[PDB]
Amino acid sequence: AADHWAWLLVLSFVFGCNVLRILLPSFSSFMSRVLQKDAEQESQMRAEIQDMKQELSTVNMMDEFARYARLERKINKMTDKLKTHVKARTAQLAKIKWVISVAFYVLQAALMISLIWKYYVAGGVGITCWILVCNKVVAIVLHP
């Protein structure tokens, strides 16, 4: 039953494929720790925002309109600034997710060629689907 033993070890490495798929935090931890700095700087920007906001809440549009519009321009400036910045950080995170997902696609194909060389025909003609099915259906049950 050594042939069945070897084929089930293959199927365990197939498990390994969606292990790769779920490796996303093991990589994204780096990027999260990296972004945290600008993230807290951005929170401090939000602070400044609220600061100048309540400051505005202390001024008079009817007379001190000049300073009012000045502050208002400053406010909208910093506001769109932080909004753009956080949107850009999210775009960076999505970039990382995409590229690492495709790198793990490459890991998938690497395991494919690994199994091929391992068993190294009708045998291949069958086993290819025999492993494709379980791999992709486990990937399916990952995310409905």
Partner 1 sequence: RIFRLVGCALLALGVRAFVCKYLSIFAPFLTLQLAYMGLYKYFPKSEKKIKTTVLTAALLLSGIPAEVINRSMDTYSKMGEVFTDLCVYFFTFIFCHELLDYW
Partner 2 sequence: LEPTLSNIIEQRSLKWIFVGGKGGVGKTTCSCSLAVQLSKGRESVLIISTDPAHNISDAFDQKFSKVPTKVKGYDNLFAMEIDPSLGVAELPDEFFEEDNMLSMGKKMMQEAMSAFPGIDEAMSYAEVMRLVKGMNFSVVVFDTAPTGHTLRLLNFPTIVERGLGRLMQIKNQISPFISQMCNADQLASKLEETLPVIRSVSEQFKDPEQTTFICVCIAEFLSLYETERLIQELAKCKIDTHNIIVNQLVFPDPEKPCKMCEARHKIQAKYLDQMEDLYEDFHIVKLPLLPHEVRGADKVNTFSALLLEPYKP
Cβ distance to partner 1 smaller for residue 21 or 111: 21
Which uninterrupted H or E stretch holds 68? Answer: helix 65-119
CB of 47 to partner 1, least distance (A): 23
| Cα–Cα distance for residue pair 56/67, rounded to 1 Å | 9
Tell me which residues touch partner 2 (CB under 8 A).
57-63, 65-66, 69-70, 72-73, 76
12 binds partner 1 (CB under 8 A): no
Which uninterrupted H or E stretch holds 42? Answer: helix 24-56
**Identified binder of partner 1 from the candidate list 9, 22, 47, 59, rule CB under 8 A:** 22
Other residues' Cβ atoms within 10 Å of the Cβ of residue 117 = 8
Instruction: Please choose which of partner 2, partner 1, none residue 109 contacts, taking the beta carbon within 5 to 8 angstroms, the exact cut-off set by kind.
Output: none
Angle made by CA atoms 98, 101, 103, in degrees to the nearest 5 = 110
In one letter, which amino acid is 9?
A: L
126 binds partner 1 (CB under 8 A): yes
Contacts with partner 1, residue ranges (CB under 8 A)? 1, 4, 7, 22, 25-26, 29, 126, 129-130, 133-134, 136-138, 140-144
